[PDB]
């Protein structure tokens, strides 16, 4: 509920080149990831957060979600590259 924002009419009268679509995707993903890693590490360092059941039960979910997200991005990327190889490769 804190600081929500959404873009509208994203494709209604302008379209990006694929060259840019890839670049925006990469950037928006890489920064979110790096911030999530820092958040986890900080929640581990603070002595008041690693010793309270309420805060540990929150940290378990963060680690689970990070691990699932990075695994899904990696698998889809590998599979999509494979198809371009099968197209170009004589």
């Amino acid at each position: 509920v804190i600081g929500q924002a959404v873009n509208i009419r994203s494709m209604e009268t302008d379209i990006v080149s694929l060259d840019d679509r890839l670049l925006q995707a990469f950037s928006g993903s890489a920064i979110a990831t790096a911030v999530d890693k820092q958040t986890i590490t900080n929640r581990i360092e603070d002595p008041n957060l690693v010793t309270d059941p309420k805060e540990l039960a929150i940290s378990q979910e963060m680690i689970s979600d990070y691990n699932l997200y990075v695994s899904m991005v990696s698998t889809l990327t590998r599979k999509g590259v494979g198809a371009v190889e099968t197209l170009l490769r004589s």
Binding site: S17, L18, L23, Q24, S27, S29, A30, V73, S74
Partner: protein, 221 residues
Amino acid sequence: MGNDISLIALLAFSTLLPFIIASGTCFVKFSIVFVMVRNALGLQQIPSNMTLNGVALLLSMFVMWPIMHDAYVYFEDEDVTFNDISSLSKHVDEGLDGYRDYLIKYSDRELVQFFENAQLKRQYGEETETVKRDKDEIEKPSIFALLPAYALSEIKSAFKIGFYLYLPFVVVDLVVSSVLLALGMMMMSPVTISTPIKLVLFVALDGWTLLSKGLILQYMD
């Protein structure tokens, strides 16, 4: 690595690298010129393709190395440079201009203009004004539009160079055929006689020296 997506992107790039070399580097040109020479001398299987592609790849290394090194140190550079999504996307984009400048310097202006206009008419609609940038600063065109223009430009110029090299051997062939008809030996296949004259002509020219010199000097002042 300090970040996981930065790693995934690097492994993808390293998986597509060979096609980028096969379609966006002078290798496409050297490879053609040597096959043209072999056609000219009337040979079929010698030198082997593996030998000619070997030298073509080595020579391409001297020409491409400086910009690959530049991009490498640019992306290794340890000094703090970006903070947020807009700064990262600009930092990555800025890192590719060393290679856009290369493609643009050798691509034909007319082809670059064609592939650019035909993309604008896909995205924004064919009624969008046909640019006719006849006096032009082509505004950092997209690399997907820029790359096939380079490929067809190099094919053009390699064919052009290959044409010139035939003309002496063409002379040799027509001369031999005329002197045999002057003697009436209509049943003699000229190729048997004309092949060694071609070989000794090329050796006397020292073709491979002249040719490999000029092909490199075309890319550096």
